[PDB]
Amino acid sequence: MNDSSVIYRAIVTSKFRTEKMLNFYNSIGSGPDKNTIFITFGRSEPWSSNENEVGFAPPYPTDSVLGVTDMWTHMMGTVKVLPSMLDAVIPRRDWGDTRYPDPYTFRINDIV
Amino acid sequence: MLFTFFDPIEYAAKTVNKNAPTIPMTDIFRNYKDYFKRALAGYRLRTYYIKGSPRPEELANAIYGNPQLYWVLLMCNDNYDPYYGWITSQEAAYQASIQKYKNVGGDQIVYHVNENGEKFYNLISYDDNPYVWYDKGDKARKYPQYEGALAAVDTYEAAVLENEKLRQIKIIAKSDINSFMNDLIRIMEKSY
Amino acid sequence: AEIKQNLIEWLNGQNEFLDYDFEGSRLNVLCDLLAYNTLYIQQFGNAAVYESFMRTANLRSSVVQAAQDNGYLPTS
Amino acid sequence: PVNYQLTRTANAIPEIFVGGTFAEIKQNLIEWLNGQNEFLDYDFEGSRLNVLCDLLAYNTLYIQQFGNAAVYESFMRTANLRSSVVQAAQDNGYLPTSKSAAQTEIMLTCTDALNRNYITIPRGTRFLAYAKDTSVNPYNFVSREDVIAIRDKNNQYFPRLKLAQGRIVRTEIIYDKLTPIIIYDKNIDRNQVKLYVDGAEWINWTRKSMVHAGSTSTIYYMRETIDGNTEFYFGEGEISANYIGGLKPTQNSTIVIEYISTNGADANGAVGFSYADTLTNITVININENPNDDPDFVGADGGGDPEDIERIRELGTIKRETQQRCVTATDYDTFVSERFGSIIQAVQTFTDSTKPGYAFIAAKPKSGLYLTTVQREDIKNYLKDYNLAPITPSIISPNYLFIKTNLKVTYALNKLQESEQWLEGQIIDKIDRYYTEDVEIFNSSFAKSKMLTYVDDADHSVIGSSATIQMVREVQNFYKTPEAGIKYNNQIKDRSMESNTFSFNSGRKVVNPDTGLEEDVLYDVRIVSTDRDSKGIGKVIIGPFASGDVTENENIQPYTGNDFNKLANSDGRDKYYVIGEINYPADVIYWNIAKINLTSEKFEVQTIELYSDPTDDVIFTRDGSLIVFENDLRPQYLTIDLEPISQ
Amino acid sequence: DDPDFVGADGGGDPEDIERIRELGTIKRETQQRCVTATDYDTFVSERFGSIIQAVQTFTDSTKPGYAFIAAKPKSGLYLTTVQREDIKNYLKDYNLAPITPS
Amino acid sequence: EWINWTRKSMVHAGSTSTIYYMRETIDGNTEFYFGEGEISVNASEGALTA
Amino acid sequence: LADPDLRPLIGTMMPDSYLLQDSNFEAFCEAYIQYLSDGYGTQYNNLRNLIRNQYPREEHAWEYLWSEIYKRNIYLNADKRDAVARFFESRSYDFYSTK
Amino acid sequence: VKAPSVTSLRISKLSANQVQVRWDDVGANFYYFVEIAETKTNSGENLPSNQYRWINLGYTANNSFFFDDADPLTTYIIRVATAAQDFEQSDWIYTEE
Incomplete structure (x- = not known):
């Protein structure tokens, strides 16, 4: 509970957020078990x-x-929705476009 | 000297600041009030003086007693507070009223006093509305109390009403007090 | 002990020797309060020493305080 | 600590009370008098309006004690002045045993001329006892209870009874209901009282000998009313009981109190008793056995005198943790206590995990060593009534570690008065006072330096002191030692753990001069723990042997060498037999004489001391084993030298 | 259809001296627990005395942890089910410890 | 509704129990004071945790 | 609620303006009664309000500090301990009876 | 992933030109940086966020850094926060003016 004598620290990390997603798509398939x-x-x-x-x-x-x-x-x-139509995505930052606010930069960990 | 009567003892006060100095002190720890109580047995039917004057704390030098005893009036009423125990000058209660409520609420209305004396306590009328009283909450109404009517005592009146009821006391009649005090010693010398 | 309290305090007023206004009134008037005080407190304390002790300590509300604590709440 | 939120505080008188040093009061008043309020318009003077400030400060510093002391003795932990302490301890259900009386159980061998069966021996039966300091004067004794005897075979009786110290007194009184019935005398153990009301019984409340499940009314109450004089009173009941409460008397009754005079604690001596019996044909045959029970006996026990202030408090608050019932290890410690106390110095009850039920209780009487019996069975019963029903209490007594001093105080002849003797004894109690104060209790160690500073405190003339030391721990059954038992808890300083005496029997006959023959009861033996070795090792030996009696076989071949394993001094012909382990680093002793396979009948009485000397100066303790020195009972080891100095 | 009858009530405010004798009956009273062999007999007989009569409880060494109690009906001989069960309750709210009733 | 706990003792009611208490006062009135406890739950935990 | 300050009560027990003609006598005698009576920490209050401070839940109360559980709880929050240990010393009879 | 907010933030042994701050450990590998601000401006009383600015005094790998300067009768209101490599900064905490 609150303010217990023992205090523990737990990350839950990132991957659990993703790995949990994978199990969702990992059965979309065809059959009695695959819950389309x-x-x-x-x-x-x-x-x-x-x-x-x-x-x-x-x-x-x-x-x-x-x-x-x-x-x-x-x-x-x-x-x-077929299994093939669902897709996993990322914000798509790209260097060189003038339309989007900051042309290059792309600080530390970013996808280009 | 009808207090004291024993010795200074010594008051160690060692439970705080060890090796504290011993200070001779008038002895107030005897359970005196019991001696008075048991000694009084047989002198009872001490009448009701009714007071009648905002006698300052000591009327002992006027009415029964009068070696300026300033008690046997106390032990009468089992007074816990020698200041506000006795009745006070009429203004004192008023003066006492302010300091009581000065912090919060200002002057108020403590209860509304039905005739026959049924107190109410945070029950509130609405003028220009139904004539029936309501509690200070559940402002949706729907829950009336005391369909009748009565009159509030506000605050000042209460303190007056409360301290003025404090004038009756026992006496020992100015007759027994000598014979009485002559006993009250005997019980004391008895236990030692 | 009302006169004996002021008489002992009246001697300390002459310890300073001449206090000016303290000859008649003007001091003992304010020093009579100190004499009328130290008596009641010498008593009121003793009266207030015995409450939390149950079998001692007369009146009532002092008992019910020490009663319901460690005891039960008495019937209203 | 780590997290600052754990600071809190112990019992703390807040800054609100505390109270003045004087001049700080002068400071605060001046700031309140001159400042924030007046900015003086005072008509006294430049100096007078100043001077008069402390004239009312002495009025404060006075009223800041006279009236401020009340809150100190209003509470418990911060109070001083017994009276408030005691009087505030009864609402916690305690009472502080104003005094106590000695008690024993003696078995009277007497007989009657009428030969009638089922002879009685009524309440008082006045005895008298010297309670020996030398001889002169008796005190008194009264049995106070009943019993019965039985005639069997030859015509004799064994009306074994128990007895208290004082005499008795009975004062009957008419109950006025306005009259707080009391006693006034400095006496009367509240443990033993009767108080009939005109019929019988009235088993009261605060102390039960039975608890008499149900039984409703007939209880009474015993508290204090300060002053040392006990208060009796009765409940609020009606009995027209009404609902719940005390039965109360009815407006007039004969209330018969009987107590015990309880001469005092001076009577601990006991020993020889005399009949002083005049009743009827009972002859009072004497042959009175004071201790017919068990091992060593000190005489009577108890005697009391009122409990100290520092005792009550600790027992006063803990009895709020309990309510008149013991479910907890710390409860038995409070139930073996001034209720049954003055016969027990310290307890530390514990429960062994391997053996369920059976709450174990270690106890040391003020008389020292063992509680004997019927003073044990007494502690038994008083618990089991308030106990947790299935589990049975048991008195094991602690495992005693005494210490052997051999100290020399080296005084100076110049400054003495009573010279030797009186100083020889004056050094005793000072040492004894050291134990009783510091190391009498459990879990506490002692330092010989702390013993010497009470030694050097004898009077004046003693200057300097010093001692050797040996930790003595005596085995009970011997011949074996328990499994992984017999441990000092301290580093043993190898080449120590020296024997005691022993003896032998058998050895053929060996007739002597004068009368016919003897059993060859001479030629004793004794044990030595030898050396250390690669890690613990060290073995041990049973002792000197000549030849003949043993079973050699292949498993013995008696020898440790002419190396260490020091020799007993006799003919004795060496050939020490190996017996047991004794691992040094973790202190352990192991014997089991059956290794060399002798007969236990060849050994004399068991319960032999061993007494190794310690390595370090300070001696520790653990596992419910006390270090307590009691001289008067066993003088066997105390030796002191007064060797003087002439200036 | 009760016997001789008047409109019932409770009392007024209780007296003073009768207050003092109660706390003495509190400390000496073990509330919301049974720590003794005679305490089970106290609670069982106080509530259920209208049906149960003549109870005693005895603790048996070599079988720690039980504390058998012996109860007799004021009506019949053996205790019925949904009674023996109901006596076993209301002691579970208190009980203590290991050592549970029988 | 909350159950009147004035005399059941205490322990039999665990944490967060709706039980409320009452006592007397030095001047003769009655006080409805409640217990002390909260049902608050952490973020990453999810448990009730009285 | 403030409770009486004792200042107006004994203010009339003084012999008015007689025997001291300067106002420095009255205003001073006023403010000295404060240091005895009106306040939290002063004697007449700290005394008269005793036995009202025995009930631990009351404000300014103490002696629950001395209790064995106020000493032994490891709660990291500092205020809760003073809330629960101030409680439970209000009703101790609950726990001790149920041990 | 907010780094655990610091707890029990107290001042100890403050002087005119020296003031010390203390707080609970809150973790092994974190870091702590602090902020210091005047409040009263030339014997005035002013509103938060309209004032104080802030002054970074640096960061520390252990609790309770010791601070200097702070001209007498001025400054006050220390504030701290925790931060680490992988965590977002926590929320500020103020000490008792």
Whole structure:
């Protein structure tokens, strides 16, 4: 608990954040065990009186089943995500572009 | 000299600053109040003097006793505080009121005193509203108390009401006190 | 001990010899408070020495203090 | 420490109380008087308005003691002045044993002329005892309880009883309910009291001999009311019991108190007792055996005198950790204590892991050494009532390590008064006072330098002193030693651990002159621990042997050499037999005479000293083994030389 | 349908002197624990005395850790189940230590 | 609702237990004072840890 | 709540302005009563409020410091120890009975 | 990965021209650098973050560095933080003015 007599230090490092991700993709496959993924599309209802504009925003969804249930009511169609389409990414810094703020530099550990 | 009566003893005070010097001191540790209590047996029915005057701390030299004894009035009421134990000049309580509440709240209303004397304590009316009183919290109302009406005693009045009820005392009647004190010694010389 | 306390303090006022205004009043008036004080405190302390001891220590609220501590809270 | 948050503090009187040195009071008052408030308009004078400041400062420094002392003796740990201490220790359920009386158990051999079975021996049965310092004068004794006897075979009785010191006194009183019944006399062990109320019984509360599960009312109370004179009183009960409380008397009763006069602690001597019995046909045949129990006996025990202030406190607060029950090792130490105390100097109870249950209790009586019995069985019972039910307490007694001094005080003849003797004895108690204060208790060591500074403190004429030293530790069963036992805890200084005496028997007959023959009981033996070697080694030997009795076989071939293994002085014909290990660095002794395979009947009485001398000057202790020197019981090792100086 | 009946109550504020005799009955009382062979007999008989009668508890050496208790019903002979079980509870809230009841 | 703990003793209620206490006062009033304890949980831990 | 300062009480027990004609007598006699009475640390307070300081949870109270558990806890937070050891000496009967 | 914030930051044996700071270890291999600031400006009272600036006094490999200068009746408000090779700097901590 708080302020215990013994005090320990634990990093959790980086790799666990990545290795945990790998296990996610490592079974997307085909079969009973491989739990494939499906994306899905949306609602037909005007959703409000002010609907199309910049200000205002949809109401924040809710994790409760009361919010889980309305999707399957308001949903049309589900595209599937193959194993091949998902991909792991990195911010892509590049040297020499003038468009992005700092042309070269790239301090210490950075990807170019 | 009806206090003292024994010896200085010596007060070591060795539990603090070891090898502290011994200082002869009037002996206040005897459990005197018991001697008085047991000795009083048989002299009871000491009447109720009612006081009646903001007599300063010593009326002993006026009423029963009068070798300026300044006690046997104390042991009467089992007074814990020789200052605020006795009643005080009417203004003193007022003076005592401020220093009590001076830090927080300022002057206040301690309780609202129903007739027949039912105290309330942090119960609050709303004027220009229903006439029924409410606690100082749950400002949503919904929980009324004491549908009736009464009158607050604020603060000054309370301190007056509280110290003024402190005037009654026992006496020993100015008759026994000599015969009494003649006993009160005997118990003392008894135990040694 | 009311007169004996002021009489002993009145001798120390002459230890400084001439105190000016301390002949009549003006000092003993302020030194009568010191005489009226040291008595009550000589008592009030003794009265306040015995509370935390239960079988001694009369009145009431002093008992219930020492009662519920190490004891039980008494019925209201 | 490491983290600064662990500083805290021990018991600390805050700066709020403390109290004045004088002149600092003069400083604070002047700053409060002159400054922040007035900026004097005072009409006295330039000097007077100054001078008058300390005139009321003596009023402060006075009222800063007279009234400020109360909070010192209001609490416990910071209080002084017994009275407050004691009176505040009863609400912790303690009481401080105002005095105590001696106790023994003697077995009377007497008989009656009527021959009637089941002879009684009522309460008082006045005895008298010298409690010897020389001879003159007795004190008194009373049995105080009951017992019974039985006639068997020849017509005799063995009404063995126990007895207290003083006489008795009984004062009956009418209870006024306004009248705080008390005693006033300087006496009356609260351990033993009766106090009937007009019927019987009234087993009270604060001290149970039974605890009588349930039983409700009939209790009474015993506290202090300072003054040394004990207070009795009764509960709030009604009995129209009502609900809970003391039964209370009813407005008028005969309240019969009986206590024991308890002459004092001067009676520790005991020894010879006399009958002084007049009852009925009981003859009082005498043959009175004071110690018919067990090994060495000091006489009576206890005697008390009131407990010191520094004792009460430590036992006063710890009894809040307990509530009238012992579940813990530190509880038995508080239950073997002024309740059963004055018969036990120190305890340190512990539990052995290999043997469940069986809470073990080491105890040293003030009489010294062993508690004998029935003073042990007594400590047994008083615990087991408040104990944790399944586990049984047991008194092992500690493992004693004494020390052999042989010191010389070398005084000067010029400045003495009582000369020798009186100084010979004046040096005793000073040494004895050193033990009782520092090293009497457990876990504490002693330094011979600290013993010598109490030696040199004898009076004046003694100047300088010095001693050799030997740690004496005596085995009980001998012949074997326990498994991995018999350890000093100190470095042994090899070429030490020297024998005692022993003896032999058998050796054929060897008749002598005069009468018919003898058993050849001469020709003793004794053990020596020899040398050190490559690491520990060192062996040990049983001792001198002539020839004949042994079993040589192939496993013995008695010898260590003419090397070390020093020789006993007799004919003795050497040929020392190897017996046991004795590893030096980690102190261990091992014997097991069965290695050379002799008969235990060939040895005389067991319980033999060994007593190696220490390496270092200071002698340590551990594992519940005391170092305590008691002279009066065993003089065997104390030797001092007064060799004088003429200037 | 009670016997002779008046509207019940509690008392007022308790007296003074009756307060003092209570703390003396606190220290001498072991609360929320049973440390003794006669303490089990005290708690078992105090609560359940309306059903249990005549209890004693005895600790047996060579079997440390149990402290058998012997209870008898005020009604029948043997103790029924969901009673023997219920007596074993309410001693688990206190108990102590090793040494658990039987 | 919290259970009135005024006399159950203490230990039987562990940490964070809703039990609340009450005592008397030197002037004769009543004090509802609660215990001392918190349910706070660390960041990287996740446990409750009374 | 402040509690009485004893300053107004005995202020009338002095013989008014008589026997000392200078105001330096009254204002001084005023501020001397402070050092006896009005305050936390002064005698009349430190005395009268005794037996009110026996209950450890109360402010300014002490003697819980002397307790065996205030001494032995290794809590790294310094304030919590003074919170829990000030507690538990309020109700000690709980733990000691349940040992 | 914030390096553990320092704890129990106290001042000891301060003089007019010398003041010393102490704090708990908090770790073996970390480092600590400190900041010092005046508060009152020429007998004025001023608002935080509108004042104090800060003055870096350097970093230390052990707790409790000893500081000099600090003209009398001025300065005050020390502040410390911890840092290391792989960790982001912790949060500042102030001592009792």
